[PDB]
Amino acid sequence: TWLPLNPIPLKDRVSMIFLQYGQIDVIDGAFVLIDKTGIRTHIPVGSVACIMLEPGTRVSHAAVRLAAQVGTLLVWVGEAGVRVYASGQPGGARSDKLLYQAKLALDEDLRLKVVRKMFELRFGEPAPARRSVEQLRGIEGSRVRATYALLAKQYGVTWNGRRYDPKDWEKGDTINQCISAATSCLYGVTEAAILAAGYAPAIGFVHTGKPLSFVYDIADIIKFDTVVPKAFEIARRNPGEPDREVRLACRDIFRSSKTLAKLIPLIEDVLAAGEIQPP
Amino acid sequence: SMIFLQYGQIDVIDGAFVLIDKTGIRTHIPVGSVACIMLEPGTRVSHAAVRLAAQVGTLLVWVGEAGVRVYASGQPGGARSDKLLYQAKLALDEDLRLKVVRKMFELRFGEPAPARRSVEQLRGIEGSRVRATYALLAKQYGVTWNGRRYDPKDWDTINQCISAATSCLYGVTEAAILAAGYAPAIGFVHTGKPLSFVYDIADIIKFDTVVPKAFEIARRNPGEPDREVRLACRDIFRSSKTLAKLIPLIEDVLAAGEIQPP
Amino acid sequence: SMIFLQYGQIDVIDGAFVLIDKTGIRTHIPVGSVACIMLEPGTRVSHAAVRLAAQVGTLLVWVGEAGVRVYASGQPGGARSDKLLYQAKLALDEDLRLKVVRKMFELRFGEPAPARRSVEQLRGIEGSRVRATYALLAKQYGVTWNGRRYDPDTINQCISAATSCLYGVTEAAILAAGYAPAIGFVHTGKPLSFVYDIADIIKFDTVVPKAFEIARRNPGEPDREVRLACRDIFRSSKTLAKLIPLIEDVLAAGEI
Amino acid sequence: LPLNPIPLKDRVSMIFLQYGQIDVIDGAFVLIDKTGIRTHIPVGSVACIMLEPGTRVSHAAVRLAAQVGTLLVWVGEAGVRVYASGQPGGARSDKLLYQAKLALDEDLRLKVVRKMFELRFGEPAPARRSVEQLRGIEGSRVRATYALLAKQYGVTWNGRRYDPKDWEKGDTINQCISAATSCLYGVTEAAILAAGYAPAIGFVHTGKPLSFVYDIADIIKFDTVVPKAFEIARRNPGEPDREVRLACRDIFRSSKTLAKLIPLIEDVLAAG
Amino acid sequence: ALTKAEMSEYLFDKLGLSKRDAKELVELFFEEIRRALENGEQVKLSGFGNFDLRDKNQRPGRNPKTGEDIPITARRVVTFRPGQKLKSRVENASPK
Amino acid sequence: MTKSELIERLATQQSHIPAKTVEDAVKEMLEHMASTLAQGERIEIRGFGSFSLHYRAPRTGRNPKTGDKVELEGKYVPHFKPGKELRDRANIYG
Amino acid sequence: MSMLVVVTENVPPRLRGRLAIWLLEVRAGVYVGDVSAKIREMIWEQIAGLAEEGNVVMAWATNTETGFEFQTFGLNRRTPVDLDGLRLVSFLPV
Amino acid sequence: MSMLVVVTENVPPRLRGRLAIWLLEVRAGVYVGDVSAKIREMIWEQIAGLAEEGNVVMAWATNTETGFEFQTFGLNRRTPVDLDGLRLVSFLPV
DNA sequence: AAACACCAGAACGAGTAGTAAATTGGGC
DNA sequence: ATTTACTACTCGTTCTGGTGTTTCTCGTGTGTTCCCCGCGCCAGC
DNA sequence: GCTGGCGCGGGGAACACTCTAAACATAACCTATTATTAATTAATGATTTTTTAAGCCAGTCACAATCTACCAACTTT
DNA sequence: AAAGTTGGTAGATTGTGACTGGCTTAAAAAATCATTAATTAATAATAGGTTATGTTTAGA
Incomplete structure (x- = not known):
């Protein structure tokens, strides 16, 4: 009277x-x-x-x-x-997948290969060669902040800079709340995907030291495709319940873009960069 | 702690x-x-x-x-x-892998390993010592022994007891690993399975106290062996402080790779 | 039969x-x-x-x-x-359609229609004369009359039940003759057009007046009593059995 | 409360x-x-x-x-x-007056009959010919279809019989054929009356009260209806009627005939 | 007694080779010498001695149990001629 | 076929073994076998033959080139006996 | 044509027969079918019209996040509850 | 991803909790969800696994003639009965 | 302390006896 | 002749509150190839 | 406009194998039987084969260094 | 805003150095050999007492 409790695929779940x-x-x-x-x-x-x-x-x-x-x-x-x-x-x-991630993480050349694949997957353009990893972090950060300013002007929300900590939020910030809550939703389903395939969420490439480097990277690949703009719509509309609308909107984004079903092939393509055939 | x-x-x-x-x-x-x-x-x-x-x-x-x-x-x-990459680096390098596996042999049976010997060969030696320990313990506690052949369907009384004992062993071993912060899937003697490091460090102290208690409770032959076995294992883990002392054990096991853990 | x-x-x-x-x-x-x-x-x-x-x-x-x-x-x-194509042949020809409609007026009020009157003109005659008959009989049997209005009020509900009973027996008579309920002359387009027309032939003979009388008696459940009474008239007067030659002459107005 | 029926295409056959x-x-x-x-x-x-x-x-x-x-x-x-x-x-x-109006003209009737022939066999009928010899051509073409499909399935075929009395207790071929064509007559009249048309106004056949059902069923019977009945006659089960009804109903399931029947009827009536 | 295992053991000890390779070397080592001698070739191992092939003529023999004379058929036998290096090392040996 | 000529034919058949490995092995194998008989212990390779040590009774020998006498003390000599398979495969004659 | 699920409780028998006109009565008070959305709303009109102080919940197939949607009529110990846009069901105490 | 409906009766509480792990328990013994065919057959394996002398029916959406399919486990006064290839339900007498 | 097995006990609502009643559910 | 409404009235079933009762549903050399389900591009009212 | 109809591709069940020590199977050596046959030993200086010490010159394999050069960053107009 | 100037860091490509690899040679040691008079392996068929070594089998 004990049947084994098996988990179901992640792509066929509620967000x-x-x-x-x-x-x-x-x-x-x-x-x-x-x-x-x-x-x-x-x-x-x-x-x-x-x-x-x-x-x-x-x-x-x-x-x-x-x-x-x-x-x-x-x-x-x-x-x-x-x-x-x-x-x-x-x-x-x-x-096998963990040893593949760690193998790619130890080798500096494969590290640059995979980081290059990340830059190619975010901004749609070939990564710039003859640039160190730190330079790629600087350029990527400048491009990302430019994306914040660009979307901020497009949708029209008052932009004062990205601020993680909710301490600085001036009671009507609404922009950092939408961004942070949206990124928390995406970090949630992304971390669920990473453990679902079984990779190491702490073994990262772009970020170092922080315990969620790989999750931050994989979410940074596709957050600005669907999630951040909808967060800016919720920030522009400025409702009395920002959290509920952020949850519903991000949730419908995850249903629409088929994010979870494509997270695993996304990570396979990211880690294929190391020229070694993925396991 | x-x-x-x-x-x-x-x-x-x-x-x-x-x-x-x-x-x-x-x-x-x-x-x-x-x-x-x-x-x-x-x-x-x-x-x-x-x-x-x-x-x-x-x-x-x-x-x-x-x-x-x-x-x-x-x-x-x-x-x-840094610790996961430390362990993984110890696992990828064949020389360091042989060093640490030889340390596992050194702490497993107390005796130093034979030199110029590969990993699979050490698997053979360790396995032969395991069979010698099976026959020897069966001789000590006077229990009918026919080898470790079970089914993964029907769940024999002695293989049931030893299975439960190794389950408790995996329990405290994995708890100690996670307390130290290392990966259960990055293994040395065992590889491939998500509990490879758990299987190895579990095998390091397997035949010291726990499996003997499995043979003892198999000798007493209760109607419900599993519960008495794992409760006795609880008694061993509480009294002997095995889970508290496995952490420095893994510290030395990975220390034998000599890359100065982070 | x-x-x-x-x-x-x-x-x-x-x-x-x-x-x-x-x-x-x-x-x-x-x-x-x-x-x-x-x-x-x-x-x-x-x-x-x-x-x-x-x-x-x-x-x-x-x-x-x-x-x-x-x-x-x-x-x-x-x-x-052959019978359906005969009815349809009389229906599509406006000359023959007008012949049969003038027969419907001829048997409707007993009086012949004035010459060179169309289906629209005979429809106006029937509308004004029949509305005048509504107000007339409502005035005779002492009924408050507000213009024959229903909303999907006791008297309009009684008249409604009367029309339901008559549509029933008349439709059964038409099916017994074997013709289409939708191929009508005074009413057209509706699935009970022929039913509504031949029902209009004998509507004000006994059924609607009896509805007026029972409505003046005003019972608690009027529709059931009016329906059972119309049932009794249909049983006694053999209305369903008598409707056959009426439709025989009505469609005979096409001269075979 | 009222009782509204549902669209005909969202129904079991x-x-x-x-x-x-x-x-x-x-x-x-x-x-x-x-x-x-x-x-x-x-x-x-x-x-x-x-x-x-x-x-x-x-x-x-x-x-x-x-x-x-x-x-x-x-x-x-x-x-x-x-x-x-x-x-x-x-x-x-209006639909009934349209159908009967098209029945009134002989030439429009020939137009719609040629429409049924061109929808039935793909090829147009020979021009300026009366109805009866088109009925003879129909019989020859349908008999040729019997011999061809029976030769394809390898089933005992010696001609078409309508009365079940003359059957030698092992015929089963006319049993499957007649069961299939009768089920098709059923859903055909179901669709014709569901739209509100007159199944008594016939075009190829005359006198019978469902000649229109006979024609409309003759349009699309040879697309899916005959061959599966020939399969049930080929395999020869003990109770062929149940397998013919199940098979024909699942054919109506897969081919989705019901939803396309109404534009089919409108297309046939277009020739008038 | 010296065996194939002890020779393989010595290969394992001295050269650090796999016990699979150390086995097959000793196994084939005598195999080639078997193949060489059966190929009619003299095998002369400096520091060891000579493997010679000698053909003996048919000569009178008997059943040693009884004495019943049965002749010794002609044959090709393998003989060994120890070298002076070998002879010198053995003259002063000590039989256990 | 001498020592070195034996070595190459082995390496020829043992492509997966380095030629340098074979060279030392044949040197070490025979040197090990020599030391065994040097210590008075025998060698027996089933299917090939056996190595034994024989004592020879000391006696006053001769210098056969000159005829001069020589005092010969006792000693041990190596002796090989062909194995069954060695006897069978080598003798091609009946 | 999406799947439809109707659960009836403490309802007069008219409603259960009327629902048995279109849906399948597989268990006590639980109805399942597969019809079009217009017909789903018409049957929901039946649910609102013919029921009494009983309670009914109707669940139908969609292509939303959960792949299904449901609607309730009347009062039950199990009351639907929304969690941030997600409609769940909660069990009230006595 | 097809619709999934599980109706439980006379089942031990383990099966009801296990079914509530994946499916939504909207009424007493009424479970509704939307999962794939596999996972459907896995949950059906749970149904066959834990229901003791109970009766459970699982109904799932397809693209067949009814638009959905169902199968039963255990014994009920309402049992599925085939009508010329069509699976319906018959109401057994006492 | 949570949680499962198992039990009686209370709702409780489904199903089934009886009985009583209707023959219906618009109007064109 | 059938069907429906209403009213007891039984009783299978589901829930709740009591007791025990138990703190779980377990086995581990590794890599290497067939098997079918699953996203993913073409025809459509 | 999101759906139905055929497609491969990916992640798991057989299976396909490695290494140890010890226990066992067994066919292969050992001795000890005879007398007649066949072939080795004693030794050294002279000669003869085989192996090898030392190049030692060629190459070639891996790693230090030096160089192209891109594509963004930052001054100049 | 657009060109023009830096520039540092991948990737490639060369420079160098240390170590394998045969080839030829040198000699250096090691084997033949010529020639004693006699001893001593070499044998056959048979039984039985070691054991070297293939074969399996529980262990990882």
Whole structure:
């Protein structure tokens, strides 16, 4: 009377769900959310690519077990939906792909090959040769900031510079909230894809030192194709509920662009750059 | 270090991890003094608690009783890139791979490995010593032994017991690896599977205490062997502090590669 | 001609349509002598009985209570092509259409129509004269008249039930004759155009006046009592049986 | 509340019902068996329902059948159409006057007949010819189609027979053919009446009350209908009728004939 | 006694070769000498001695159990002529 | 076929073995075999033959070139016996 | 033609027969079919028109994020709840 | 990605929780979702795995004549019955 | 402390006896 | 003759609140080739 | 305008194999049987074969250094 | 805004140095050989007591 609990492919899942103010428990083998008033909320954890946990939640041990067994990443988030903590099963990773990523990460020449492939995949143009990796970071950063200014003038939102920390937000910022929440949604489904294929989310190429370098890179590939413009639409319209509209809009973007189904071939194409046939 | 928390709710009240018990007994845990928290079954962690755990970088790993299992871990897939690249570099270089595998042989049976010997050859030697240990322990505890042939369908009593023992072993081994922060899939003697490093470091201390207890409980022959085996393994892991001492073991195992871990 | 069968099951055992009551009261029916069999509510016909009825070309028509409504009928859209093409030939020729419409006025008010009057002009005559008849009879039987208005008010609902009953028996009569309910003359385009026209032939004889009387009595449930009363008139006066020669002359106005 | 029927293309093709009494329970079309197993039938999702021997239908069931516009057809042995009933008022008078108007002219009738021939065999008919010799050409071409397709499937073929009495208990070829053509007659009349046309106004055949159904079915019978019945006659099962009905219904499923039938009829009537 | 294993063992010890290669070398080492001598060729190993082929004429023999005389058929035998280097090392040996 | 001529034919058949490897091996194999008999231990290669050591009774020998006597002390001499397969394959005559 | 699911509870028998006209009665009070969207809204009109103090939920196939959509009539211990644009179902206490 | 509907009855709570892992539990024993054919057959394997003396039916959307397909596990008074290739449901007597 | 097995017990609503009633669900 | 509404009235079923009861559903040399499902381009009312 | 109809491509189940030590199978050596046959040893100086020390010149393989040069960054007009 | 000037860092291409690789030679050691008078392996068929070595088999 024990059938093995297998996870389903990630491309055939719901993007994300946000949970707040209620205790997380399991009843009879189901991921159910119970509120303090007693209303129980059945949550199809096996149908979700990633579940986002906002403040007010109390997660049980068995709930973490069940979430891990279905390959659904739980993400503890906080103010303005920023990612703070996450946990899912690490062992959804057959070693050939990890050794391929690490092999490409150790070799400086293959490192430049893959970074070049990233620059070619973002801006649609061949990467500039005779440039070090640091120079590619500088040029890429200047081009990205130019993209922020360009979209900011296009849609029309008052741009004062990108500011990660919500501390500096002047109660009507709405632009950094849309950007940061959108990037948190994309980092969510992207991290879910990375662990779903099994690569190392900490072993990165462009970013160094920070524990989410590879996630930041893979999301930086395709955030400005679909996500950032819609975030700027939500920032321009300026509603009283920015977070809900950011979640709905980013969610429909992920449904429309088929982002999760193409994240895995995207990473395969990124890591193919090392001239070695991917595993 | 490490800490086990059981049968109580994890909240934050006074800036410290408090354990909310059924009687109200609160267990004050300072934000420091711990590098990783292993959460045993029966605990319900609060959101503010998880935020505090992230804020001081303390890894949370949801485990079983005394680390009998590892269900989920934070920082999934690793947390420090330098340590993962350190291990992977040790795994890619054939000379360093042979060095570290020879260290695993050195700590596995106490004896130094024969020189000018390859990795697969050491797999053969280690395997022969494993069979010698099977026959020898079967002779010690007086148990009918026919070899380790099981089915992956029907789940014999001795292979059941040893299977459960190796399961607990994988539990504390993986918990120790994640406490140190290394990759379970980047292995040395075993490769390919996502628990290769778990399989290897598990085999390092497999036949010291745990499998002997599997043969002992197989001798006592209970109706439900698995539960008694893994509860006894819990007793071994708690009393002997195996999970607490595996971390410096892996520190030396990877130290034998000589690239100065980060 | 036709037969009314109620509260009994139709089977065939010995070459005759038997009507089977709950107590066993059998109605042995010779298969011919009737062109159509009316199946009133409460009847359950077996497959083999439908087969035999099909074998003799006798039209089966699932009706309302005593034929008050037409719910379903076999041979839908007609059975013999010559009669339908005759009606259509009279329908498409505006000269013949006007001949038959003038026959409808001739039998409608008893009075002949004035010469060289079109379908639009005779429609104006019928509209003004018949509206004057509405106000006239409403005034005679003491009915508050506000212009024949309905919204999909007791008197307009009673008149509505009367028109429903008449559309039922008249439509059953047309199907018994075998012609199309939609190929009409005074009304056109609608699926009950011929039904609405021949229904308009005898509409103000007894049914609408009885609706006026029962409406003046004003009961709690007017539609049911008016429907049962119209049922009683249809049973006693044999209206459905008498509508056949009327349509025979109406379509005869095309001079064969 | 009113009871609106659904579009004809969003419907199951046909259902054959046997050995049970049809009653209505709480506004539902139910088949009641003698053993007490009652069968809920989604009658509003069906285009046409076939009534086999053994069925006993009550008045209110026929009323509900008419109010949802699903044509009920009494069928007997060999699946041949026996009787049918539908609602009278489901027709627009302009369409009927159009069909009959096209029936009034002999030359327009020849135009539409040539339209049926050019839609049937691809080639136009020989010009300036009367109807009867076109009927003879039709018979020769259809017989040649019998011999050709029967020679393709390798099935015992010695000519066409209509009465099941002359069958030697092992004929089965005319059984499959007649069952298929009768099912096609069923869905054909179902579509013709669903749009609101007159199936009594015939073009090739005259006198019979469904000559129009006969012509429209003769247009598209030889595209899919005959060959599968020849397959069921080739494989020779114990109960061929069920396999012919299942096979023909799934043919109507795959080829999606119902939705395209209305523009087909409009295209045929264009020649008038 | 010196065996193929001990010779392979010495190849493993001295040259660090695989036990598979160390086996096959010793295996084929005598195989070629088998092939060479069966090919009618004299094999002369400096520092070891000579492998000679000598043909013996048919000569009277018997069953040593009884004495029943059965003749020794003609044959080609392999003989060894130890070199002075070999002879010198063996003259002062100590038989265990 | 002498020592070196034996070496190449082996390397010829052992393409996957370095020629330098074969050269040292034949040198080491025979030197090892010599040291074995030098220590009084025998060599037996089944299918090829065996190496034994024979004692020879000391006696006053002669210088056969001159006839002069010579005092010869006892010693041990190597002796080979052909193996079964060696005997069979070498003798082509009956 | 998308898939349609109707769950009936505490409803008068007229509604269950009327729904049995188009959909299949596979279990107690649970109806499933596959019809066009116009017909789905007409059947939803039936649900709003013929039901009593009972409660009905109708779920149909779409091409949205979940691939399906549903709508409720009446009151139940299970009440649909929206989570940031995602319509889920929550179980109320007694 | 086709529609998926699971109706449970007389099932142990494990099966209901397991089905709630992927599917949405909108009514008492009524589960609705939209997944692929594989994952559908995997969840059907769960249904065959955990239902003890219960009765469960799973219905999924296709492009067949009904536009959907279903199969049953266990015994119910309502059982699927074939009508000339068409799978419908019959209401068994007491 | 959470969560599963298992139990009685309460709703509770589906299904099925009876009974009573209607023959219907527009207007053109 | 059937169908529907209403009213008890049984009873299978689902939910809730009690008790135990248990803290799990487990085995590991590695690489190397057939098998079918899955995104992805052409014909369409 | 997003759908239905054929297509490969990717990620998993057989299977296809490696290495150890030890235990076992067994056919192959060992001795010890006879007397007659065949062939080696004692030795050295002179001669003869084989191997090898030392080039040592050629090449060639990997790595230090030096050079093209791009495509953006930044001054000049 | 558009050209013109830097320029540093990939990638290529050359320079160099150290180490393999045969070829030829030198000699250097090692094997033949000429010639004793006698000893001593070489054998056959047979039984039985070692063992070297192929073959399997549980272990990674």
